[PDB]
Each structure stands twice: as structure tokens, then as C-alpha cells.
């Protein structure tokens, strides 16, 4: 299911850059355990920049 999540992030990564905005990631995380606030907090703990290496985020924060 984190495996699936990574696939979903990849589906919305239109240019296959490995990056998504925090916003994009929150929108997707809503459509799929964490509270809305936990998603915000997790993404902010991971990085202060708006563009997020979603694979690394999943590895560090979710796995």
C-alpha cells in the first residue's frame, strides 16, 4: 500500500522528474490513514522546499 502510493505519485508526475509539490502530494494522500494535519506535518518535517522527492519521502517517512 505504500508500494501502491509510490505508483500513484508516479502516475501524477507528468514529466517523470521524481518530484511533486507538497500540495499535489497532500491531494493524493487524501485519496488514500494519516490525518490531514499529519500529512502537512510529515511533508514539512521532511523538507522546507515545495518540491518533494516523493520516493525519498516515502522511504524516510512512511517505510
Amino acid at each position: 500500500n505504500v508500494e501502491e502510493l509510490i505508483k500513484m505519485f508516479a502516475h501524477f508526475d507528468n514529466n517523470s522528474t521524481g518530484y511533486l509539490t507538497k500540495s499535489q502530494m497532500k491531494n493524493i494522500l487524501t485519496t488514500w490513514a494519516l490525518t490531514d494535519q499529519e500529512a502537512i506535518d510529515a511533508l514539512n518535517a521532511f523538507s522546507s522546499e515545495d518540491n518533494i522527492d516523493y520516493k525519498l519521502f516515502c522511504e524516510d517517512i512512511l517505510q
Partner: nanobody
Framework: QVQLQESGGGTVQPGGSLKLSCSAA?????????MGWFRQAPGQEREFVAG????????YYADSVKGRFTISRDNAMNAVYLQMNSVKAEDTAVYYC?????????????????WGQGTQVTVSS
């Protein structure tokens, strides 16, 4: 989220025992959140001490504390504990409890989202 507050800090003799508590106020049931203890000695980086899965069923330790420190949690009381036995000089530090947003274990500060306040443990004769 999880609000986290440690207690039980203070002074302990070399070779002695002390137990730290960390109370958690989680938005979801506490068993969803893996917990860890970290410590930061004076002017040093914060380091992993011990971790426990959401359910409490698996516990993990830093090599330097294995066989001396014990981590446990009581999900019915929203608490996590660190029993420190056979304490040594190396153990003097500010101790922090920390929560992940998933129930599986991590040994890295990068795996943790929520942090406590910090409590001083001093090993002194």
C-alpha cells in the same frame, strides 16, 4: 499529530537505574505511531537510542545501549518508557521521545515527525 512530553529526568549514579516516561496525545489511536528515544549530549548531534513499533511487539536498540536499556509502551495509557540500567558516563544527555506517522520501526531521525520537549539525564557519582 502527537503531542509528546517526557518526564523522569534527573541524576543517577554510575551503575544505577532510571526510567523515563513519555506521554503522548495522539489524534489517532496510539498503536498507529512507532516511537523512538533519541539523545543529544552537549554540543553533539541527536542520536538514536531505542525504538518500538506501534503495537509494541518489536523493540530495537542502539548497539551501545543494547542489554542495558529497555523500551516499552502502554497503548492503553498513551505512554512510552525507557528503562535505563547499568548507566555509564556516555549516557548523560538530553533525552527526547519521538513519533513516526506509521507504526513500523525506524532508527533514523529522518523517520520521525513529532518530538517531545527534552529531559536531562545526568550520570554523576
Amino acid at each position: 499529530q502527537v503531542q509528546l512530553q517526557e518526564s523522569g529526568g534527573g541524576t543517577v549514579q554510575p551503575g544505577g537505574s532510571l526510567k523515563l516516561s513519555c506521554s503522548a496525545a495522539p489524534e489517532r489511536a496510539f498503536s498507529n505511531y512507532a516511537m523512538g528515544w533519541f539523545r543529544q549530549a552537549p554540543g553533539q548531534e541527536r542520536e538514536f537510542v531505542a525504538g518500538i513499533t506501534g503495537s509494541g511487539r518489536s523493540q530495537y536498540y542502539a548497539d551501545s545501549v543494547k542489554g542495558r536499556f529497555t523500551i516499552s509502551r502502554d497503548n492503553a495509557m498513551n505512554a512510552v518508557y525507557l528503562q535505563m540500567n547499568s548507566v555509564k558516563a556516555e549516557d548523560t544527555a538530553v533525552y527526547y521521545c519521538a513519533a513516526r506517522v506509521v507504526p513500523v520501526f525506524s532508527d533514523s531521525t529522518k523517520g520521525y515527525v513529532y518530538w517531545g520537549q527534552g529531559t536531562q539525564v545526568t550520570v554523576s557519582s
